Structure formats: structure tokens, C-alpha cells
Amino acid sequence: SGFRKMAFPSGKVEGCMVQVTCGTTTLNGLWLDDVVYCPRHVICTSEDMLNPNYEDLLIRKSNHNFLVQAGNVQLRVIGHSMQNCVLKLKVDTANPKTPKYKFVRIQPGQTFSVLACYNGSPSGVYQCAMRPNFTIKGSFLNGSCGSVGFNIDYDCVSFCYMHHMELPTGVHAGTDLEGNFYGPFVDRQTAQAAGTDTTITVNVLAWLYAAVINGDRWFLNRFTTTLNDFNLVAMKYNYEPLTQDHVDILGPLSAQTGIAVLDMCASLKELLQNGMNGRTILGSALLEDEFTPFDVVRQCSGVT
Amino acid sequence: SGFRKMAFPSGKVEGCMVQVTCGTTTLNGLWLDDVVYCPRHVICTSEDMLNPNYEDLLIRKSNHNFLVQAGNVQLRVIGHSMQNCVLKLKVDTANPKTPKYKFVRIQPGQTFSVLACYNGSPSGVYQCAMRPNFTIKGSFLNGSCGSVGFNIDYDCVSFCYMHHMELPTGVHAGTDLEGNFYGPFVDRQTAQAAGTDTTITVNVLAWLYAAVINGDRWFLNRFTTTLNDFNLVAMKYNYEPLTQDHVDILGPLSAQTGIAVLDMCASLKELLQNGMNGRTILGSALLEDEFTPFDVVRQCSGVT
Ligand SMILES: *CC(=O)NC1=NC(SC)=C(C#N)C2(CCCCC2)[C@@H]1C#N
Numbered sequence: 001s002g003f004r005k006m007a008f009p010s011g012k013v014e015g016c017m018v019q020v021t022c023g024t025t026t027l028n029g030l031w032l033d034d035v036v037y038c039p040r041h042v043i044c045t046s047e048d049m050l051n052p053n054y055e056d057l058l059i060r061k062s063n064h065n066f067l068v069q070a071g072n073v074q075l076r077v078i079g080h081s082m083q084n085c086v087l088k089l090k091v092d093t094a095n096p097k098t099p100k101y102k103f104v105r106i107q108p109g110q111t112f113s114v115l116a117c118y119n120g121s122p123s124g125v126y127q128c129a130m131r132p133n134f135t136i137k138g139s140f141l142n143g144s145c146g147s148v149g150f151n152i153d154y155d156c157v158s159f160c161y162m163h164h165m166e167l168p169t170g171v172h173a174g175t176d177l178e179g180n181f182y183g184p185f186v187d188r189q190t191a192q193a194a195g196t197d198t199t200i201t202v203n204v205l206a207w208l209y210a211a212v213i214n215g216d217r218w219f220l221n222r223f224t225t226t227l228n229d230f231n232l233v234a235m236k237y238n239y240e241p242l243t244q245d246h247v248d249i250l251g252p253l254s255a256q257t258g259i260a261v262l263d264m265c266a267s268l269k270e271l272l273q274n275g276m277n278g279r280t281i282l283g284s285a286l287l288e289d290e291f292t293p294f295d296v297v298r299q300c301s302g303v304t
Numbered sequence: 305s306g307f308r309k310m311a312f313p314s315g316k317v318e319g320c321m322v323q324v325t326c327g328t329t330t331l332n333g334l335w336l337d338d339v340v341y342c343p344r345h346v347i348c349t350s351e352d353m354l355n356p357n358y359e360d361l362l363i364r365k366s367n368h369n370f371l372v373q374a375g376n377v378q379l380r381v382i383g384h385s386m387q388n389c390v391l392k393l394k395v396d397t398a399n400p401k402t403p404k405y406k407f408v409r410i411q412p413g414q415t416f417s418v419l420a421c422y423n424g425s426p427s428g429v430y431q432c433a434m435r436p437n438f439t440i441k442g443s444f445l446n447g448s449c450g451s452v453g454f455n456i457d458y459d460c461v462s463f464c465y466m467h468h469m470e471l472p473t474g475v476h477a478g479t480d481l482e483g484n485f486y487g488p489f490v491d492r493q494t495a496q497a498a499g500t501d502t503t504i505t506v507n508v509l510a511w512l513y514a515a516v517i518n519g520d521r522w523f524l525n526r527f528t529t530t531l532n533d534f535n536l537v538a539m540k541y542n543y544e545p546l547t548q549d550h551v552d553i554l555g556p557l558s559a560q561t562g563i564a565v566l567d568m569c570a571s572l573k574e575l576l577q578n579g580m581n582g583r584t585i586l587g588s589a590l591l592e593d594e595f596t597p598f599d600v601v602r603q604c605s606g607v608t
């Protein structure tokens with residue numbers, strides 16, 4: 001029993017972290033096979049970030065201008081290319097610590113672990129979600145760009161995120177491992193405002209099921225509702241609309257607890273309309289939306 | 305910017321996790337050098353746990369009765385000994401993945417990361433604190449016993465906890481790496497009730513400083529207080545008494561923010577007396593007490 005915001009074990013990603021320096025700018029890189037992936041703005045100075053033309057700045061860079069350090073050993077760069085907002089540095093040595101991996105572009109509401117890094121060295125690991133406005137509420141200081149987000153399925157690491165930017169509001173923006181930003185963000189130091197950070201309804205429901213499984217059941221009420229009625233309430237409280245796909249995804253949690261998805265929806269509806277009344281659910285005084293239904297299943301069943 | 309419940313990168317501990325089987329009971333072990341550490345109740349059946357005499361049960365066990373599996377390879381057990389509530393299995397092979405390590409017995413209020421494991425395989429990593437009643441609010445399912453808690457300083461892993469038990473209330477109890485339980489707990493399936501789970505005052509203050517550093521400053525008020533006045537309020541709200549040692553430990557946070565420790569104490573006092581009034585601090589609707597002052601410094605400064 002007990003329910004925690006759990007991140008995946010980070011060792012498989014720790015063994016891929018390198019330092020990438022180009023001129024005076026240094027950031028984190030990800031060494032997978034004989035390639036190093038890093039934000040393309042490793043070729044920029046702080047002044048360049050105001051209005052960078054990456055194609056023009058990259059013309060003035062050769063393989064030897066990129067320094068890649070793995071721990072303390074220097075990897076020889078034998079090729080370089082820009083792919084969207086990431087640079088791919090072909091090195092002469094395959095990473096001996098390359099785990100089984102895939103690059104995945106996740107959907108909003110999906111969760112992943114971030115291995116926060118500075119100078120190619122790992123400092124911490126935390127769990128977070130791709131917000132519905134395509135930002136992440138990370139914890140990143142200067143020097144963390146290039147840190148990646150990932151999920152682990154048995155022995156396979158699915159890299160889903162690379163840290164590139166911090167918006168003026170303190171939220172973070174980045175790309176998948178193909179260099180495409182999540183959301184409408186750009187790698188430029190210009191005012192980029194995020195849209196409404198709505199709550200991930202299916203995740204709140206999933207966490208409400210985990211609460212029931214762990215004995216926190218005070219919030220369970222005597223009512224039910226329909227998807228349309230629930231959605232009218234969810235729209236009022238800036239919650240994402242719930243779909244039949246989300247109901248199907250909640251199926252195993254509904255089966256395990258004996259609580260119909262729409263019955264939990266009605267419980268959530270009353271919580272939105274009345275508040276927690278000074279009470280907690282799983283040690284939280286607010287409704288948690290950064291546990292997907294699969295995260296709850298994994299944590300409540302013990303998937304290694 | 306951004307503040308997250310961050311755990312240490314777990315790779316150095318992942319490479320030490322083994323499976324220990326004795327008869328039909330299997331739990332997690334920690335392989336450091338040529339020794340494997342695990343809960344002594346690996347020699348017990350579920351019936352034995354009702355009233356075990358470990359010394360008597362251990363007489364009927366030889367080196368060959370303990371099976372140790374590292375990933376999938378079988379380590380040869382060449383010695384065994386009981387040290388308090390842990391068994392030490394001397395194996396014929398030194399762990400090639402042994403990081404730099406120390407065994408430390410932590411004080412209540414201290415935080416550490418837990419690498420939750422099942423069958424010697426890691427499933428997740430989370431951050432938690434040794435509560436003032438010597439329990440931990442972990443997340444452990446059947447098969448997780450033997451999972452360890454640790455802190456990392458540069459390249460050195462300080463192991464501080466080993467999971468041994470779940471109390472009837474859902475909280476967890478365990479030992480340091482010398483087999484001594486934190487608190488008055490015993491490795492017996494008998495009713496053990498925990499004492500008052502009080503709030504770690506110095507950690508709440510430390511998290512209030514992290515909030516100020518990250519821009520959440522609504523709670524800062526126009527008052528100050530004394531240690532004695534603050535402590536009268538802290539006693540009323542089941543908060544630990546704050547000492548001059550705790551004030552000294554908060555010194556760097558006080559220096560960085562320009563907020564005197566007793567001024568933050570007065571802010572905390574008003575928060576205890578009025579509540580949050582529906583507001584959040586660092587995305588939390590309650591006061592967080594599982595970040596030590598050192599954790600805040602590390603996260604807000606970028607220690608790898
Ligand atoms: C996202 C990020 O922080 N980018 C960085 N840009 C630049 S100039 C394009 C930097 C420089 N020099 C640093 C790397 C060194 C520390 C200061 C920021 C980063 C990073 N990370």
C-alpha cells in the first residue's frame with residue numbers, strides 16, 4: 001500500500017548522458033548508438049537566442065567545433081546534421097551503455113520521468129506530465145537543457161522529451177527526440193505565452209481509483225452521471241473533456257474496484273462543486289492529475 | 305525555476321539489486337562488494353512471521369539454502385551471518401557495479417530516495433522522509449522488502465534504509481544497513497502502532513524558502529516572532545519544535561532570500577493559524593515537509 005509520485009529507475013538514461021560544447025555554450029546530450037542528440041541552440045550564444053537563424057549559424061560550424069564528453073572521455077565527432085530543433089552528432093564510438101530504446105511522441109496528459117542533468121552529469125529524477133497546453137511543469141536550472149524525458153517498458157527506454165526552453169512564466173517547453181517541439185513553442189528568446197493549463201481529467205479519475213485501492217474512500221458518493229453531464233461540469237472547472245476512449249482506458253481500474261467509471265465521474269463532479277472541505281486524498285489537498293491510468297495500474301500491481 | 309519532489313538518479317543502486325530466495329520466500333537484496341544484504345525474514349514463511357525466533361530458524365539454514373540471483377546469474381554463497389535484522393550473505397564474486405558507498409543511520413526529518421524493487425528488479429524511484437515517528441510513507445507492494453533508501457553525494461551512495469515491514473496502518477518500517485530498525489518496530493507480524501506523525505518544521509521552512517526563490521511569495525507577511533513564541537504555535541499544530549540548530553541550518557536560505565529565519569517562522573505561524581485560504585504554494589495545497597534545507601539548496605543551485 002501507499003501511493004507515491006514515482007519516476008522510472010534512471011540508470012539506463014544516466015549511461016547515455018554526455019556534455020556537448022560548441023564554442024562557449026555547453027548543454028546536455030543523449031548518446032545512443034554512434035549518435036549524440038542535443039538542442040540545436042548549442043550553436044548559439046545568449047545574444048544569438050534573441051533572433052537565431054539556425055541554418056546560417058550552423059554553416060559556420062564543422063565536426064571539430066562540437067566537443068562531446070562522456071563522463072570525462074572525449075568522443076570524436078565524424079558528422080553533424082540538424083533535424084528540426086535538435087542536432088545529431090555522429091561520433092566514431094557506439095555507446096556501450098546504449099539500452100534498448102525508441103523515440104516516441106507523446107500525447108498531452110501522458111506522463112514521463114525527467115533525468116535533470118548539468119554538464120552531462122545527472123543530478124535528479126522526477127515524474128511529470130505533458131500538460132494539455134504542451135508545456136511541462138519541470139524543475140530546471142541554467143545548464144539543464146538537453147536533459148531528457150522518458151518512459152521504461154521492461155528493458156526498453158522510450159525517449160519522449162528533450163528540454164530546450166523555459167518560458168517567462170517558469171514553465172518549460174521542449175521537443176520529442178526528432179526535434180519537433182511539443183506545442184507551438186520555438187527555440188527563440190521571445191515572449192511565448194502558454195494557453196490554458198487545464199486539468200487532465202482521465203488522470204484525476206485514475207488517481208481517484210488509486211485512492212480507493214489504498215483505502216482513501218471518503219470522497220465516494222451515492223450518485224452517478226452521464227458523460228455529457230460530467231463534461232458540462234468539467235468545462236466549468238477547466239478540466240479536459242472526458243471521452244469514451246478515456247472510459248475504456250479506465251476499465252481495469254473500474255473492474256478492480258467495482259466502481260463504474262461514471263460513478264467515479266459523479267464523485268469527481270461533487271469534489272469539483274464542493275471542494276475537499278479541508279480533507280486530503282492520498283496525502284494531497286488538491287486533485288492530482290499527473291498519474292495516468294497505466295501509471296496507477298503499474299504502481300498498484302508492481303510492474304518492474 | 306520550478307520545484308519538484310526530486311529523487312537521486314538510481315543507476316548506482318540499480319546495479320546492486322539482487323534477488324534472494326530462501327526456501328519459498330523471495331525478497332530483494334543489496335550486493336555491495338562480495339556481500340549481499342537483505343531482511344533476515346527471508347528465512348521465514350508467512351506462518352513464521354507471526355512469532356519468529358530468528359536465531360532458531362537460522363540454525364536450520366546453510367549457505368546453499370540461500371539463492372542469490374543478480375539479473376539472471378546465480379552467485380555462489382560462501383558465508384552467512386545475522387547482523388541485527390539483516391542477513392549478510394558472503395558471495396564468491398565482488399559486484400563489478402559496486403559504486404562508492406557508505407552506510408548511514410539518518411535522523412528523523414531526513415530525506416532519501418527509495419528504489420522500489422520486485423524480484424531484484426527495479427520498478428520505480430521516489431523521494432520520501434524518515435517521519436518523526438520513525439515510519440516512512442512509502443509505496444511498497446508484496447515482494448518489495450529488501451528495497452533500499454539512499455542519498456548520493458557526488459559519486460558516493462549513502463545507504464540509509466532497507467524496507468522490512470508494512471504496519472496495519474499502511475505506513476512502512478525498516479532498518480538502516482546494519483539491521484537496526486528505525487523506531488521501536490520489530491520484524492514480527494504483530495500489531496505495532498505508530499506514534500504521532502508530526503510535521504517536520506525545519507523542512508516546511510526550507511520549502512517556504514524554495515517557494516520564495518521560485519516566485520510564490522503571497523504567504524510572506526509583515527510579522528516576525530521568537531523561537532519560543534513560534535514553538536508554542538508549532539506544538540498546537542503537531543509540528544516539531546524548531547531549534548537554534550535548525551535556524552543555523554536555514555542560514556544559507558535566509559541569506560539568499562534576505563528573509564530572516566524568524567520572519568519566515570512568523571509567516572508559517574500565520575499559515576498555520578489561517579490556512580492557505582484555497583491557495584497553493586509550489587503547486588501544493590498543503591505545507592510540504594519532505595524537502596530538507598539541503599534538498600532545497602541542491603535543487604535551487606544545481607548540485608549533480
Ligand atoms: C535552455 C538553456 O538553458 N539554454 C542555454 N543556452 C545558452 S546560450 C544559447 C547557454 C550558454 N552559454 C546555457 C548553457 C550554459 C549555462 C548557461 C545557459 C544554456 C543551457 N542549458
Ligand SMILES: *CC(=O)NC1=NC(SC)=C(C#N)C2(CCCCC2)[C@@H]1C#N
Binds near residue numbers: 345
Ligand atoms: C516485508 C515483506 O513483504 N515480506 C515478505 N515476507 C514473506 S514471508 C516471511 C514473503 C513470502 N513468501 C514475501 C515475498 C514474496 C511475495 C510475498 C511476500 C515478502 C516480501 N517482500
